[PDB]
Amino acid sequence: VITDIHAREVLDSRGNPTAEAEVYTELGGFGRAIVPSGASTGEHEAVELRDGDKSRFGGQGVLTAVENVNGEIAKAVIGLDVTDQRLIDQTMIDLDGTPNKGRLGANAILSVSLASARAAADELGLPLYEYLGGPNAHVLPTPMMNVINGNVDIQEFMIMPVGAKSLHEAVRMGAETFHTLKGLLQERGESTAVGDEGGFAPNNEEPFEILVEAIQRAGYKPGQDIAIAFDCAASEFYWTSLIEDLVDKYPVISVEDPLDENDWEGWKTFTERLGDKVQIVGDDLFVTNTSYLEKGIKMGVANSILIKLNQIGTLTETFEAIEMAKEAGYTAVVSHRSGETEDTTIADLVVATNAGQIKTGSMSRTDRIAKYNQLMRIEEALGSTAQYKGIHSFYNL
């Protein structure tokens, strides 16, 4: 039984306010969770509640969402069993009463949702991934790391160690390649300062050449050892054949949001042509919402979904999106937001669900690195029972 719930305002990796919640149980269980925040939010994402007080953080305060936790949510949830995740989440969903969590705030709700799962794992004496996924939680994710950013139209250029035999090796290959890329950029007189996700933004096809060169320089085989993924996020500058040229030219394994978030017909066309060649990920298209994913499955749109906890607002609804995707033969790529925190929940979440892929940033900034560190702790704990799939994560192909 949950005995107390407390929220506070802390800062994310961009120095912007976000919500942190703590849950206490009768047995002495403790869980603390922090909610990340996007900058390129899709228009159909769950409501992130901001104060709009221009005298605090330019109106980016989350004191209201925090008070919604400390008041209404605390009253509604205290007394529930900490292990009753679905009841806890549905209770908050009903309490809000709006489809997009706009009354209480998705950031208020998710903070409690995650802190509850953590408190439950704590009081059971289980690591988070074991509690969330059960005895067969064992698959470590093949990570796509955002090393080059976009001047440039495409938003994220990623390396993905599909040839690694463990997560540890995947992390080392990524780090070595990142630092090779860093040296490469330094030669060409580019800045080695980093964007929000830890990657570089030097001054659409050029980054593909740069990635291949960096991979080769680090002593790895492009395609076999390290492949390329990218997120167009085309909603920000709103063609299929240009994408397909890139795909056939370069060792690309995944492409995300290659078309606008509301262009359902164009997506279906895209998927028909390229669905056999590459992973096609919907991000702004699906917004971690089962109602949107269901539509795409019926239309044969995409073959993958980017899973973002705060796009939907509860751990339960996130489980439901991941499982719906799996049953449709879609991969579920568990994802960070561009505004991250010291919270590492997504690492445990992706192993718990055996999703097989993660998108949690480049090889710099602790807001990304902490996730990779946790994944390594998880792999160590799993020992011989662990599994890293690499290219075999792509059951959608």
HSE value, Cβ hemisphere, 13 Å, CA-based, for 288: 25
- The set of catalytic residues is 197, 308
Comparison of 20 and 196: residue with beta carbon closer to Cl ion: 196
State yes or no: residue 38 binds Cl ion (CB under 5 A). no
Q: Is 12 annotated as a binding residue?
A: no
Mask for 191-210, x = binds a copy of itself (CB under 8 A): x-xxx--x-xx---------
- Output the 3-class SS for 367-386: HHHHHHHHHHHHHHHHHHHC
Q: Is 32 annotated as a binding residue?
A: no
* Residue linked to tokens 């509604």: 76
248 binds, among Mg ion, Cl ion, a copy of itself, none (CB under 5 to 8 A by kind): none
DSSP secondary structure code for residue 165 in this structure: S
State yes or no: residue 366 binds a copy of itself (CB under 8 A). yes
Counting DSSP H helices and E strands in the chain, the numbers are 14, 14
State yes or no: residue 156 binds a copy of itself (CB under 8 A). no
CA distances from 185 to 173, 181, 200, 221, 369 (A): 18, 6, 9, 20, 21
As measured in angstroms, the least distance from the Cβ of 164 to Cl ion is 22
State yes or no: residue 231 binds Mg ion (CB under 5 A). yes
What residue type is 43 in one-letter code? E
* Size of the chain in residues: 397
Of 326, 257, 325, 333, the C-alpha closest to 295 is 325
Q: CB nearest Mg ion: which residue?
A: 283
Q: Is 283 annotated as a binding residue?
A: yes
Candidates 38, 195, 222, 266: give the one binding Cl ion (CB under 5 A).
Answer: 195
Q: Is 50 annotated as a binding residue?
A: no
Candidates 22, 283, 348, 379: give the one binding Mg ion (CB under 5 A).
Answer: 283
State yes or no: residue 284 binds a copy of itself (CB under 8 A). no
Q: Are strands 2-11 and 17-25 parallel, antiparallel or unpaired?
A: antiparallel
State yes or no: residue 360 binds a copy of itself (CB under 8 A). no
277 binds, among Mg ion, Cl ion, a copy of itself, none (CB under 5 to 8 A by kind): none
CA–CA separation, 135 vs 18, rounded Å?
33
**Whether 361 contacts 336, CB under 8 Å:** yes
Q: Which residues lie near a copy of itself (CB under 8 A)?
A: 8, 10-16, 20, 56-58, 171-172, 175-176, 178-179, 191, 193-195, 198, 200-201, 340-342, 344, 362-367, 369-370, 372-373, 376-377, 380
